[PDB]
Design a protein around this ligand. Structure first.
Ligand SMILES: *[C@@H]1O[C@H](CO[C@H]2O[C@@H](C)[C@@H](O)[C@@H](O)[C@@H]2O)[C@@H](O[C@@H]2O[C@H](CO)[C@@H](O[C@H]3O[C@H](CO[C@H]4O[C@H](CO)[C@@H](O)[C@H](O)[C@@H]4O[C@@H]4O[C@H](CO)[C@@H](O)[C@H](O)[C@H]4NC(C)=O)[C@@H](O)[C@H](O[C@H]4O[C@H](CO)[C@@H](O)[C@H](O)[C@@H]4O[C@@H]4O[C@H](CO)[C@@H](O)[C@H](O)[C@H]4NC(C)=O)[C@@H]3O)[C@H](O)[C@H]2NC(C)=O)[C@H](O)[C@H]1NC(C)=O
Ligand SMILES: *[C@@H]1O[C@H](CO[C@H]2O[C@@H](C)[C@@H](O)[C@@H](O)[C@@H]2O)[C@@H](O[C@@H]2O[C@H](CO)[C@@H](O[C@H]3O[C@H](CO[C@H]4O[C@H](CO)[C@@H](O)[C@H](O)[C@@H]4O[C@@H]4O[C@H](CO)[C@@H](O)[C@H](O)[C@H]4NC(C)=O)[C@@H](O)[C@H](O[C@H]4O[C@H](CO)[C@@H](O)[C@H](O)[C@@H]4O[C@@H]4O[C@H](CO)[C@@H](O)[C@H](O)[C@H]4NC(C)=O)[C@@H]3O)[C@H](O)[C@H]2NC(C)=O)[C@H](O)[C@H]1NC(C)=O
Lengths: 207, 207
């Protein structure tokens, strides 16, 4: 019998007016015997009609996969609207329902702090530039690094972690050739979040 | 449904502790709840597992569990632990295997980072412990001061770095005053690839 997965928009998508945030309702394990899928969409319990439902794609395990995509208003998502996908199939005793929304709670502003490498790490060929991002809510967030207006690609960011006050934190780690750090180049940690002014801040780091 | 859980990292690294592998069984009904367990170590049956007396969950389903005690070195030497389960609702007995992640162990580099200047505005401050370059990801991190344990800390999960090794960050939050006074704070790290399975690095206010 069929299964349903509801996917939220990307954090970046909801924070920038230029981007297009979407909610996606994927349905898997639809059979040949009853292959028709109907989708119904609701926003805060109210039906909407603007969703674009893709034609169904057969898969290698001889089950059908069908996707539906609802485009979402930036402010609706940020204002906490609930997005419901109702999925109907003649193989299902009742239509499956999933709901998704922005995590509930008062948004909190990220504190962004850049940390230089430890003295001890200077023995090595490469060094670690650390960006601590703390006290934010909800956990939806995007983090990036750049230098001299151009993007630094050798970095990893930890997932968000629930702190003891109910807020979230994370760390991002940029790895650069020691030489570059020594020369005095400026490195910048960019952070995108709803509780930031213009949904964006950045903090710089150098010696 | 059956889920096989490994030991806690701390348990396998200290001879005093008792590492255990746990075989948790979910969705057990009242009509046919007569669960059995068979355990094998490297394909060889072992009879020293203790099965837990049962508890029941919020739904009509029961939550059931068995626990096998494990030799420290067996787990560190990569032995395979198999849990076999039979039930009246089951067409066939479910079975699962688990073991330590394969690969050459790699030693953690541990670096302590003091708070950013900007965070000094606040009532509390963040002491950061960067732990990098370790393999496998099983690891334990702790903080202490004056030989006594600091409780107000959180540690990120391990994150896969670009070289195939893992890193993480641990964040200790202390009252700003304490940092100012010049107290010494220490980040303790436990891992298989460390000498005596243990290292620690200290942090304090350096004029
Ligand atoms: C038959 O085949 C199909 C398709 O398989 C084809 O494709 C290949 C994979 C390959 O196998 C090929 O041979 C086949 O032709 C199978 O469909 C698959 O079915 C599984 C379920 O069995 C389904 O479930 C998992 O997927 C969720 C994540 O999916 C995203 O990421 C995947 C990679 O990680 C992608 O493959 C997938 O497309 C999808 O990708 C995202 O798509 C959106 C929309 O397009 C994009 O916007 C997005 O960017 C993109 N991301 C990425 C990274 O690409 C995963 O989340 C599901 O997890 C939940 O379900 C489990 C319960 O089953 C829970 O254990 C789990 O915790 C998750 O749910 C939690 O709990 C509940 C929900 O249960 C929530 O309330 C809660 O919030 C949630 N989170 C928690 C608790 O934290 C799940 O693991 C696969 O996605 C699906 N594959 C595809 C391609 O659709 C089918 O199984 C086969 N059938 C049989 C019988 O064999
Ligand atoms: C009736 O209720 C029960 C009880 O649940 C209670 O929990 C509450 C939160 C509440 O919501 C309510 O549900 C109840 O009060 C329901 O059962 C629960 O749900 C599922 C059963 O479908 C089951 O499996 C999921 O969790 C697995 C891990 O659970 C650990 O962590 C949970 C917290 O996140 C704990 O709740 C849980 O106890 C367990 O905790 C660990 O336990 C050991 C004990 O030894 C400790 O040592 C350990 O420290 C401890 N804590 C933690 C934090 O670790 C999870 O692994 C499962 O995920 C995999 O399998 C899914 C298949 O369902 C895949 O979809 C998914 O991708 C996962 O990943 C892949 O799995 C394949 C194998 O399938 C691997 O090969 C592959 O490598 C792997 N890839 C990955 C990860 O990339 C799964 O999500 C819960 O355990 C169970 N809860 C309990 C408490 O037992 C039940 O649904 C209800 N009944 C009905 C009919 O609905």
């Amino acid at each position: 019998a069929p299964s349903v997965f509801l996917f939220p928009p990307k954090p970046k998508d909801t924070l920038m007016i230029s981007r297009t945030p979407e909610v996606t309702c994927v349905v898997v394990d639809v059979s040949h015997e009853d292959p028709e899928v109907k989708f119904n969409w609701y926003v805060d319990g109210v039906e909407v009609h603007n969703a674009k439902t893709k034609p169904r794609e057969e898969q290698y395990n001889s089950t059908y996969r069908v996707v539906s995509v609802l485009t979402v208003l930036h402010q609706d998502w940020l204002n906490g609207k609930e997005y419901k996908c109702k999925v109907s199939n003649k193989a299902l005793p009742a239509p499956i329902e999933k709901t998704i929304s922005k995590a509930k709670g008062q948004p909190r502003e990220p504190q962004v702090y850049t940390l230089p490498p430890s003295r001890d790490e200077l023995t090595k060929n490469q060094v670690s530039l650390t960006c601590l991002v703390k006290g934010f809510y909800p956990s939806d967030i995007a983090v990036e690094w750049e230098s001299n207006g151009q993007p630094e690609n050798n970095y990893k960011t930890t997932p968000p972690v629930l702190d003891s006050d109910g807020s979230f934190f994370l760390y991002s780690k940029l790895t650069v050739d020691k030489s570059r750090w020594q020369q005095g180049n400026v490195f910048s940690c960019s952070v995108m979040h709803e509780a930031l002014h213009n949904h964006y801040t950045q903090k710089s780091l150098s010696l």
